[PDB]
């Protein structure tokens, strides 16, 4: 799981080194940034249902054609799965915010996503629309602190760039 801690430790391990000053300093950075990203994680975990609902609504409001027969949202079960997927992504972002790195996203949502979405006719633009809406909907300080939003928006941007 990609994080400050695992990245530094793996670097040391590859060179067969004990932790030294630079490794301790990296962890210190994790301590320093923890407050903002744990705030963002806590805010997201306490309100994810409304966030997911709004995001999925934005996806289908922007792409009504998804509800046409033969398309990804042509049945209620498929629409439900769309909202479920958005939920999975928000959960992985919650995890990324807690870990301090993109590891949970990289391993549990991004790896293999393109093969899945192409075999399943799930247009990438729809997920991107859900995440763009979420990023633009964030209101500071109404929803979280400035730096918490920097962390939250950065994770959302990382997801979007993975789908670009």
């Amino acid at each position: 799981m990609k994080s400050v801690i695992t990245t530094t430790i793996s670097a040391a391990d590859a060179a067969g080194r004990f932790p030294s000053s630079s490794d301790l300093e990296s962890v210190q950075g994790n301590i320093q940034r923890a407050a903002s990203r744990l705030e963002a994680a806590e805010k997201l975990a306490g309100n994810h249902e409304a966030v997911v609902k709004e995001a999925g609504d934005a996806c289908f409001a922007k792409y009504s054609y998804l509800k046409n027969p033969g398309e990804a949202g042509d049945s209620q079960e498929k629409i439900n799965k769309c909202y479920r997927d958005i939920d999975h992504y928000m959960r992985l972002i919650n995890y990324s915010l807690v870990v301090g790195g993109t590891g949970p996203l990289d391993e549990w949502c991004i790896a293999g996503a393109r093969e899945v979405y192409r075999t399943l006719n799930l247009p990438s633009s729809s997920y991107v629309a859900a995440f763009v809406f979420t990023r633009d909907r964030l209101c500071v300080p109404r929803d979280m602190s400035a730096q918490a939003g920097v962390e939250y928006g950065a994770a959302l941007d990382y997801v979007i760039n993975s789908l670009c």
Binding site: M1, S3, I5, T6, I9, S10, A12, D13, G16, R17, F18, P19, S20, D23, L24, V27, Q28, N30, I31, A34, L38, A41, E42, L44, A45, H48, R91, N94, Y95, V98, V99, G100, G103, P104, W108
Partner: protein, 176 residues
Amino acid sequence: MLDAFSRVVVNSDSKAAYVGGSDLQALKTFIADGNKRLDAVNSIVSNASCIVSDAVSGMICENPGLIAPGGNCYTNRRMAACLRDGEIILRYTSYALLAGDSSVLEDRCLNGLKETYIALGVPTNSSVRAVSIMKSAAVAFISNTASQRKMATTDGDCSALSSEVASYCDKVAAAI
């Protein structure tokens, strides 16, 4: 490998849950003790040579057959290999202490160690003795109670960290 944070995340993922407030509280405790954790690691890595050579020497002075012909520390090649193993084990224990999780140690050091030592003929009982001496040494350096070297820190309580160091050394001893 996982750290304390990714460990929490893996456990949460088992339930498809967002990280619970209880877990967030615990991680905030980990953050609050971060500086103590860094001092703990510094105290071990800054005395790694002392720890390893004293532990291998103790293992030998308690069991001199190790250095008789046929002993697994006999010849310089074997003694060097054993000092190297002591250092490697201490290094992985220090990684576990820095990360707050034993996955690095279990996956990159201990996985297969028992079988390897069986294949080579390295005595497991002597190995556990070297590791438990390192355990006592490392705990002493964490708690700043080593007789011959002191490390100046601000006063406080690092019992939890020494207990963690000991639990990692215990994983090593259990695995072999």
